[PDB]
Design a protein around this nucleic acid. Structure first.
Length: 1296
DNA sequence: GCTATGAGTGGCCCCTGTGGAGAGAAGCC
DNA sequence: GGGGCCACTCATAGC
RNA sequence: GGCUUCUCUCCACAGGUUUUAGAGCUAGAAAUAGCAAGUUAAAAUAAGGCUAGUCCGUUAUCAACUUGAAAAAGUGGCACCGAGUCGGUGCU
């Protein structure tokens, strides 16, 4: 009698609840064998439990570090290339120069050559450092001087330029000489006036320098400048020119009456060709206009970077840095003088103390610029004569370093120009420089284009480059070796999906011709027409379809029903009145690509000839795959013999995007065995059948369907669970799905292999991490600062906003609205905000949202003003302008503004009200379907004689709202902060409710009593999944030198005492080792038994040969058989049932779960929401009275917490602190008592101890920092469900 | 009487900022 | 959020 | 049909940190006191690995025992009456 049973499952991002129930909702208990060496051979357990595990991580950090590693290697290569070029000459002047550069990081003890790196003698070094204080001085000297300089300084200059070459965002050559904004603006205006003498622009008196160099958005600057020009418009020709100079993408369709879109952008690489196209349409007279526009753009960008450099030289960057240094020097002198003359006492503080934020800290210490300004600002204002200093302080220009974080804006072309200037000046003296000028310039300019990828020789899983010849790739010969076009093709292809019906075929591009034919014939396939005298609608014949397509689809971009009726039925077939069914006013499919190719090639027969189909498809695929025009030219050169040069150029300009769903082989590649026709052939002509694509692929009379189920191959690349890896979602849900599958398998194993009747699955809600949320909070902080600065509200500058005020939606939303209510606009003060209530934009009942964007601040009275309705429309209108102002401040999110516009439109109607309610209830529930499918596939594996899957097992999906309603109705409250039994209880309720509802489509006496018994069980299996830690070797910050053995070397020969290094390696896992250690100065052998930590860095070394690794650490006479591998969260048991989990080699976590009787849980839930009951007033009052009557349970709860703590926690001081705090607040209101008590369980929660707040008193965490006591505990190994246990007593191992 | 350790307790510490190019899947409309 | 490291203070076992 | 959000891959940039070099001077046995100076540079940026690449090294996977290089496979009785981390009784 296989006991019929059902299994419940609760899948979350961190836990998997599992429960086994019979038909009577009872949870059976069984007696289980226990292996090991203890006396406890049989333990009885309940069939319920929940599995806890660490959340998975995505791959983002790994990708970031991998890319960084590649950059570092390639930069080292560039330095190597320059040194390789210079080696032959540098050998004659100073042989050891490169050794000195290479070993400079070593101490004087370990250097092999003389200690000064550059010249190796002190006098030359001192003279050099006095003559050129910074490398930029050397750069300017070499640029301007015509004299022969020492080769070593040339190497220094070239190396500094190469190793910090700067960004590549701006493409194309740039002229540094264009640095006058006003001059070039005037020149552009004069050119416009000359070409438009009839419409001169009055730009006299306009300070374009201030407007264009203003630190605003590009569109705002465009509006600002045009507003100062009378009669000129934003979208006008001159407005478009100014937008171009600002770096935007103006449209010149309208200004020149053009047929097609005319967008030009200087930052685009194709500016030359597009500008040439525009000139070919409007005339070559306007070329000077756009050249002046380009000059203006260059001036704008350079003045924005370099802040108005004056003196004429080919090296503006070096001059700017030197000027900055000189101003720094002068201001330091002035500040010293003033401080010493007025405030002598603080001189030592500002100029000597490194730990502070003074100047000494700003230079020698770790202080950044912002901190130095913050510390120095108040002192300057208390002294006299600091006007210039304060002005420079507000401008971020006082005492500025040369190497600062603003340099990210420097285009590389500046460095390229300085390089070329140096080489040109010094080429006369050094002949070898002349021949290698192009090589040296290209080393700076070259980069690997993004579509090629790593240049790997097959041994890297990330690589896709196809190499022509097996030579080593160098920056000078990149073109000859790497096939760029095939590289790009592969780069696009490998990311694309595959056809579902033919998994081994690639999908065709969206604008492929055959796709358009397929869609047109598919739509026309089911079109029915009714003429006079017809009793029934008739399908269109193949001849009719051919005629209609040839007449309309090849002649018009879009064909409508009226067009068909007036063009084919009446003109060709002579039918006056015809009814068309199934077609909605137009056909979705259109031959847009065909019409475009007709416009380009201008040959109807070439397009209509089926022999050209392959050529056209390859051309379309070429247009889809490649986005750089040069490659397109390269591949189209194959068909250049079929098209003239202008046609060739036209094709290079068109672009298509998107990919379809069906492959070529599926539609026109496979042929029916009986007929020889493809799906396209049948759609063109199917006779009386007129079978569509769905019918053709599902018709049993054709070979297409049969070949389809032939192709369906249940392949599992690598392991089978790789199917799970292919699902849509974060790995956080995916790890849980895999655990759920294995748990189901083990439950089936335990029950006796008889299959479960039914399975209930349900999904919980995801929670983001605290640290990453904190970084989000910091970004939101800086955005708040930007917004408030645009507002000008001064309240924030007195007190900087705290991360909690961001996390607390109230203050953050206060800053979003600039202290103005969003329903109805009035000034609001934060003290009044404490009273005010926050409300969703959408009415609460209609739709609820967890996100902060929907939940917006409002004043309490207007919050009460409207309920279950959108805000009144007129006040939303008056708020809309202020909302636009906030959007310009970027304070309010765009989606929030969309919600506001939805509110003003009115949005929800009664049917749409029901839609929004059902829509808050509904979750995307798409991953859930895949989980259900996987479980169904694993369970139901038998096919009937008709090859139909026999469904013995029914997979069920429910929604959390039903279970929540069930809990609320019958007072099965749950509180998360108590313990981990909540997941198990949720799974149990899921199973019960699912089975009940399926049977209905229940004894209210017996069933509820059974359920209350089930929720009252103290024994629930909680297992923490053991995991071997992996990840970084240590913390990434390098710490200074100090006398300790706990530092880890950065390199093999870099002693930490002399060079410092990393700290705090993360222990992969600990091993129990019994051996002998020499202790004392006598080196006496002592038998010891201790835990040794294995670092992640050493893991391979330990696993390769444990004995040698243990020996090298100083242990002797290691017993190999006793090497027991103990991962993180390994479980130990001590006396009195006190349990611990091994956090690492030296710290432990609490290991026991508090079993709290259910009546206390109900009381706490009722007390916590005493003022937030959502129900009938009568039941609310009954609950309130029930809370009042059982007030004495509070002392009961304190008693149970105290007893549990004294039994398993051992936190004497913290427990005494808690007890002392409790008596102090014994007259507080009950609700506050409950909310504080809820926080109290954090002491007794499973896992790592954490601090908590109790009323006003804060309790620090108690940490178990000694692992001696578990060396004689009972080790427990738990199977993934915790049902099977093997107990090993370590006290009998390695006795003294 | 003098030496050395170890054990616990409290407190501080943790790499960050950006741009460009793409193939894919889902919120609200 | 949680493990690592350090200064200090007491204790402790041996000698 | 539109939008943004999220997963995954590549190419770049700007910093930060570490050590060393940039003659500290004067009085003073020293402690120390005064005075001057400070902005830059080289190298490393997970230990390293063999497949020697202008490549690879932080994702995912992991109770114990037996067989396996690994992937993987095999290994653990039932019923009833009770419940403070599960206990007792009968059958096998």
């Amino acid at each position: 009698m296989d006991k019929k049973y059902s299994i419940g499952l609760d899948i979350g991002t961190n836990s998997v609840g599992w429960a086994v129930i019979t038909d009577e909702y009872k949870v059976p208990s069984k007696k289980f064998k226990v292996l090991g060496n203890t006396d406890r051979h049989s333990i009885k357990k309940n069939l319920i439990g929940a599995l806890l595990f660490d959340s998975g991580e995505t791959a983002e950090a790994t990708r970031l570090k991998r890319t960084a590693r590649r950059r570092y290697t390639r930069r080292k290569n560039r330095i190597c290339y320059l040194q390789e070029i210079f080696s032959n000459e540098m050998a004659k002047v100073d042989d050891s120069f490169f050794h000195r550069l290479e070993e400079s990081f070593l101490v004087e003890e370990d250097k092999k050559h003389e200690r000064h790196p550059i010249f190796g003698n002190i006098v030359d070094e001192v003279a050099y450092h006095e003559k050129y204080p910074t490398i930029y001085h050397l750069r300017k000297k070499l640029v301007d001087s015509t004299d022969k300089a020492d080769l070593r300084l040339i190497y220094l200059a070239l190396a500094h330029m190469i190793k910090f070459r700067g960004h590549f965002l701006i493409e194309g050559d740039l002229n540094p000489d264009n640095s006058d904004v006003d001059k070039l603006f005037i020149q552009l205006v004069q050119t416009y006036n000359q070409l438009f003498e009839e419409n001169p622009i009055n730009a006299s008196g306009v300070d374009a320098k201030a407007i264009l160099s203003a630190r605003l958005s590009k569109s705002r600057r465009l509006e600002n400048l045009i507003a100062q020009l009378p009669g000129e418009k934003k979208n006008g020709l001159f407005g478009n020119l100014i937008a171009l100079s600002l770096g935007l993408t103006p449209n010149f369709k309208s200004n020149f009456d053009l047929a097609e879109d005319a967008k030009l952008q200087l930052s685009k690489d194709t500016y030359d060709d597009d500008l040439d196209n525009l000139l070919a349409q409007i005339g070559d007279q306007y070329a000077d206009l756009f050249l002046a526009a380009k000059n203006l753009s260059d001036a704008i960008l350079l003045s924005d970077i370099l802040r108005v450099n004056t003196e004429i030289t080919k090296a503006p960057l070096s001059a700017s840095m030197i000027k900055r240094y000189d101003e720094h020097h002068q201001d330091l002198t002035l500040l010293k003088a003033l401080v010493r003359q007025q405030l002598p006492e603080k001189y030592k503080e500002i100029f000597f103390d490194q730990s502070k934020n003074g100047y000494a800290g700003y230079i020698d210490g770790g202080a950044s610029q912002e901190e130095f300004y913050k510390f120095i600002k108040p002192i300057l204002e208390k002294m006299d004569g600091t006007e210039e200093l304060l002005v420079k302080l507000n401008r971020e220009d006082l005492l500025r370093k040369q190497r600062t974080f603003d340099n990210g804006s420097i285009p590389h072309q500046i460095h390229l120009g300085e390089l070329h200037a140096i080489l040109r000046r010094q080429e006369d003296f050094y002949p070898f420089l002349k021949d290698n000028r192009e090589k040296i310039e290209k080393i700076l300019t070259f980069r690997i284009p993004y579509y090629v990828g790593p240049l790997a020789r097959g041994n890297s899983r990330f690589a896709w480059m196809t190499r022509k010849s097996e030579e080593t790739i160098t920056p000078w010969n990149f073109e000859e070796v790497v096939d760029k076009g095939a590289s790009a093709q592969s780069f696009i292809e490998r990311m694309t999906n595959f056809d579902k019906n033919l998994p081994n075929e690639k999908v065709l591009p969206k604008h492929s011709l055959l796709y358009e034919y397929f869609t047109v014939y598919n739509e026309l396939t089911k079109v029915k027409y009714v003429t006079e005298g017809m009793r029934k609608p008739a399908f269109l014949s193949g001849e009719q379809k051919k005629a209609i397509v040839d007449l309309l689809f090849k002649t018009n971009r879009k064909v409508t029903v009226k067009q068909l009726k007036e063009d084919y039925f009446k003109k060709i077939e002579c039918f006056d009145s015809v009814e068309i069914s199934g077609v909605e006013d137009r056909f979705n499919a259109s031959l847009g690509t065909y019409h475009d190719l007709l416009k380009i090639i201008k040959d109807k027969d070439f397009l209509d000839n089926e022999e050209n189909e392959d050529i056209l498809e390859d051309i379309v695929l070429t247009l889809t795959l490649f986005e750089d025009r040069e490659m397109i030219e390269e591949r189209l050169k194959t068909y250049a013999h079929l098209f003239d040069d202008k046609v060739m150029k036209q094709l290079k300009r068109r672009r298509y995007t998107g990919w379809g769903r069906l492959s070529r082989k599926l539609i026109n590649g496979i042929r029916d065995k009986q007929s020889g026709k493809t799906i396209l052939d049948f759609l063109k002509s199917d006779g009386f059948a007129n079978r569509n694509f769905m019918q053709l692929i599902h018709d049993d009379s054709l070979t297409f369907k049969e070949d389809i189920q032939k192709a369906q191959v249940s392949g599992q690349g690598d392991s089978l669970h790789e199917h799970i890896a292919n699902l849509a979602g974060s790995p956080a849900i995916k790890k849980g799905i895999l655990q759920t599958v294995k748990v189901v398998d083990e439950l089936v194993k335990v029950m006796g292999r008889h299959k479960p009747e039914n399975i209930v699955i349900e999904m919980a809600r995801e929670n983001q991490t605290t640290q990453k949320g904190q970084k989000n909070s910091r970004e939101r902080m800086k955005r708040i600062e930007e917004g408030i600065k645009e507002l000008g509200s001064q309240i924030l500058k007195e007190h900087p906003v705290e991360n909690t005020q961001l996390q607390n939606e109230k203050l953050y939303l206060y800053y979003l609205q600039n202290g103005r209510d969003m329903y109805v606009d009035q000034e609001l003060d934060i003290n009044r905000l404490s009273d005010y209530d926050v409300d969703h934009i959408v009415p609460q009942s209609f739709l609820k949202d967890d996100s902060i964007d929907n939940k917006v601040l409002t004043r309490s009275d207007k919050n009460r003003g409207k309920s279950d309705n959108v805000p009144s429309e007129e006040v939303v209108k008056k708020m809309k302008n202020y909302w636009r102002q906030l959007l310009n401040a970027k304070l309010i999110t765009q989606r929030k503004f969309d919600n506001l516009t939805k509110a003003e439109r009115g949005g929800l109607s009664e049917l749409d009200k029901a839609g929004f309610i059902k829509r808050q209830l509904v979750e995307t529930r798409q991953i859930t379907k895949h989980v259900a499918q996987i479980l169904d596939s694993r369970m139901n594996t038998k096919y009937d004689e008709n090859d139909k899957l026999i469904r013995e097992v029914k997979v069920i999906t429910l929604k959390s709202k039903l279970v929540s309603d069930f809990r609320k109705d019958f007072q099965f409250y749950k509180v998360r902060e108590i313990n981990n039994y909540h997941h198990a209880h949720d799974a149990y309720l899921n199973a019960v409710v699912g089975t009940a509802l399926i049977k209905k489509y229940w004894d209210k006496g017996r069933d509820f009593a059974t359920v209350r018994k089930v929720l009252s069980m103290p024994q629930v299996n909680i297992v923490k999944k053991t995991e071997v830690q992996t990840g970084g070797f240590s913390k990434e910050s390098i710490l200074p030198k100090r006398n300790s053995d706990k530092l880890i070397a950065r390199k093999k020969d870099w002693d930490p005492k002399k060079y410092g290094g990393f700290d705090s390696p993360t222990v992969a896992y600990s091993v129990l080792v019994v051996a002998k250690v020499e202790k004392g100065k006598s080196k006496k052998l002592k038998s010891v038994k201790e835990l040794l930590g294995i670092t992640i860095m050493e893991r391979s070394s330990f696993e390769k040969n444990p004995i040698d690794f243990l020996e090298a650490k100083g242990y002797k006479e290691v017993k190999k058989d006793l090497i027991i591998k103990l991962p993180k969260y390994s479980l130990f048991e001590l006396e009195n049932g006190r349990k611990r989990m091994l956090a690492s080699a030296g710290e432990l976590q609490k290991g026991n779960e508090l079993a709290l009787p259910s009546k206390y849980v109900n009381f706490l839930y009722l007390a916590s929401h005493y003022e937030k009951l959502k129900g009938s007033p009568e039941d609310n009052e009954q609950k309130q009275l029930f809370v009042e009557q059982h007030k004495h349970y509070l002392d009961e709860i304190i008693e149970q917490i105290s007893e549990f703590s004294k039994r398993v926690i051992l936190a004497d001081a913290n427990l005494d602190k808690v007890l002392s705090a409790y008596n102090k607040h014994r007259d507080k209101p009950i609700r506050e008592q409950a909310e504080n008590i809820i926080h109290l369980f954090t002491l007794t929660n499973l896992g790592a101890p954490a601090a908590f707040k109790y009323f006003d008193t804060t309790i620090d965490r108690k940490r178990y920092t000694s692992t001696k006591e578990v060396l004689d505990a009972t080790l427990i190994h738990q199977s993934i469900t915790g049902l099977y246990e093997t107990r090993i007593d370590l006290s009998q191992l390695g006795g003294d």
